[PDB]
Amino acid sequence: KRQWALEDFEIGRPLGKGKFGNVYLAREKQSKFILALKVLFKAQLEKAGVEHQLRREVEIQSHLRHPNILRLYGYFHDATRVYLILEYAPLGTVYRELQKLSKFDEQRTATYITELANALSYCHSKRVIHRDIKPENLLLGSAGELKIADFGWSVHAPSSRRTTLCGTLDYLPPEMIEGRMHDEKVDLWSLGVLCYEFLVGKPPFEANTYQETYKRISRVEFTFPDFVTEGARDLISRLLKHNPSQRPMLREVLEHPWITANSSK
Numbered sequence: 001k002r003q004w005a006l007e008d009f010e011i012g013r014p015l016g017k018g019k020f021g022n023v024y025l026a027r028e029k030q031s032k033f034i035l036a037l038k039v040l041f042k043a044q045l046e047k048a049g050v051e052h053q054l055r056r057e058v059e060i061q062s063h064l065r066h067p068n069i070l071r072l073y074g075y076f077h078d079a080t081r082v083y084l085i086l087e088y089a090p091l092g093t094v095y096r097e098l099q100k101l102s103k104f105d106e107q108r109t110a111t112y113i114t115e116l117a118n119a120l121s122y123c124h125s126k127r128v129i130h131r132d133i134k135p136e137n138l139l140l141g142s143a144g145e146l147k148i149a150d151f152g153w154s155v156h157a158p159s160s161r162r163t164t165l166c167g168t169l170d171y172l173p174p175e176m177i178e179g180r181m182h183d184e185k186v187d188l189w190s191l192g193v194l195c196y197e198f199l200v201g202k203p204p205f206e207a208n209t210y211q212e213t214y215k216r217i218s219r220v221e222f223t224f225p226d227f228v229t230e231g232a233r234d235l236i237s238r239l240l241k242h243n244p245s246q247r248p249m250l251r252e253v254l255e256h257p258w259i260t261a262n263s264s265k
């Protein structure tokens with residue numbers, strides 16, 4: 001843990017907010033190294049009963065080493081808060097990039113999907129499933145490279161564990177919203193949802209209510225606007241399969257002709 005304390009850092013501006021994570025820019029006083037401190041309130045973690053998720057986030061993320069996965073350097077705590085020491089992502093979230101641009105072109109989409117597929121291939125090689133691949137958890141590095149972050153819902157495959165109860169269902173596959181046993185194929189479904197949202201500007205199963213969203217996901221009810229190309233329609237339709245066993249391997253996504261034709265690499 002390298003015996004860190006709050007007094008070793010100078011805190012800066014807020015970088016973002018999560019349900020539990022309050023994230024700030026920070027500088028280690030001696031080295032001047034810039035990082036991010038994810039601050040969590042012990043009383044709120046205890047009330048919600050999410051201590052096990054925090055333990056998994058720290059245990060899983062601290063051991064991953066990949067350029068498209070955000071590093072977790074360490075942690076410390078005081079009487080009321082837990083502090084996670086994270087690699088700072090200077091270009092913000094893919095969530096904000098999408099609000100600004102409205103929709104991404106095919107080259108930007110394919111490049112993000114490749115980076116996501118490479119990070120997930122590394123995770124899956126260790127049987128680590130992320131399960132919370134959503135644009136607010138995809139951060140951007142100094143070279144504009146995508147970094148997977150927020151490992152709070154991560155687990156070792158297979159799992160029957162529930163995630164959110166009232167939160168966004170938009171990125172979750174049918175087997176997760178139904179409470180069934182699931183594995184690595186959960187991240188392949190989220191990849192298809194992201195590919196669709198990047199090109200269209202909204203996720204495929206979006207609805208005004210929780211029940212209607214649930215209905216659309218369980219029945220896999222989505223249509224493409226006219227501007228979506230054949231190659232993108234083909235990849236998205238292969239990823240958004242109700243049967244998880246029918247979803248492609250990550251190597252099949254990385255070699256898909258629409259991906260190799262449009263990724264910047």
Ligand SMILES: Nc1ncnc2c1ncn2[C@@H]1O[C@H](COP(=O)(O)OP(=O)(O)OP(=O)(O)O)[C@@H](O)[C@H]1O
Nearest residue numbers: 015016017018019020021023036087089136150152
């Ligand atoms: N290292 C970072 N660099 C820059 N911004 C960050 C960083 N980590 C998080 N953020 C910003 O803070 C927001 C909240 O962080 P995070 O996703 O880790 O919290 P959370 O959603 O509350 O966590 P959890 O789902 O584990 O309970 C992110 O969506 C992003 O906007």
Ligand SMILES: O=C(O)c1cc(-c2cccc(Br)c2)nc2c(F)cccc12
Nearest residue numbers: 042043045046051054055058075077082
């Ligand atoms: O009772 C506590 O002090 C407490 C500690 C921690 C904790 C300590 C070291 C590393 C990590 Br990760 C977490 N977490 C708590 C929590 F999540 C809720 C309530 C109390 C604690």
Ligand SMILES: [Mg+2]
Nearest residue numbers: 018136137150
């Ligand atoms: Mg988050």
